[PDB]
Amino acid sequence: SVLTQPPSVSGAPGQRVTISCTGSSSNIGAGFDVHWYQQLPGTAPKLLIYGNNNRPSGVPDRFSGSKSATSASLAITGLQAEDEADYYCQSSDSSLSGLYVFGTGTNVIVL
Amino acid sequence: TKCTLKSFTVEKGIYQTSNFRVQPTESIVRFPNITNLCPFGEVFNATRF
Numbered sequence: 620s621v622l623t624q625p626p627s628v629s630g631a632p633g634q635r636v637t638i639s640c641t642g643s644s645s646n647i648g649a650g651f652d653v654h655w656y657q658q659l660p661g662t663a664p665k666l667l668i669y670g671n672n673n674r675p676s677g678v679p680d681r682f683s684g685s686k687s688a689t690s691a692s693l694a695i696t697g698l699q700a701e702d703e704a705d706y707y708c709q710s711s712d713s714s715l716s717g718l719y720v721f722g723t724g725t726n727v728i729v730l
Numbered sequence: 731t732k733c734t735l736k737s738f739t740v741e742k743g744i745y746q747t748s749n750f751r752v753q754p755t756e757s758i759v760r761f762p763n764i765t766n767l768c769p770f771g772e773v774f775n776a777t778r779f
């Protein structure tokens with residue numbers, strides 16, 4: 620019951636980029652939040668957004684996101700050169716089998 | 731008869747002492763022929779109640 624996710628996206632420095640994470644009624648349905656995570660190349664990873672509306676400390680304000688029923692999406696306003704990393708969308712499932720299910724993963728390219 | 735009358739001497743006559751009953755020979759169990767498993771784990775697990 621893995622979550623669907625587009626392979627990768629490209630963008631240019633200075634303007635907004637957007638990514639999406641889509642699932643089904645069993646995983647994202649019935650009012651289940653989606654969280655996001657990072658993957659720096661060869662570095663211990665870090666959180667981006669939890670609860671789909673809140674935001675932790677130590678993260679730039681240029682990140683935002685929201686969900687539309689079956690799908691969810693996030694936007695970065697003004698991507699920079701340090702955004703070269705891997706992004707993960709994580710949700711839960713109806714049963715205890717899928718307490719933690721992650722997506723395949725998406726990557727961004729500057730310029 | 732001696733046990734029923736609780737004595738060692740039985741007088742002339744006809745007495746009732748016990749009851750004869752035929753015992754069953756084998757057991758026959760019949761149930762419907764269904765195979766679907768009840769989804770107990772669907773309700774007994776569940777993330778939120």
Ligand SMILES: *[C@@H]1O[C@H](CO)[C@@H](O[C@@H]2O[C@H](CO)[C@@H](O)[C@H](O)[C@H]2NC(C)=O)[C@H](O)[C@H]1NC(C)=O
Nearest residue numbers: 714715716768769770771772773774775776777
């Ligand atoms: C709730 O989930 C647990 C697993 O976390 C289920 O327990 C398993 O049940 C199966 C089927 O009987 C067994 O083969 C496993 O060995 C059990 N594992 C554990 C952790 O005991 C449990 O059956 C589910 N709900 C119910 C129906 O009680």
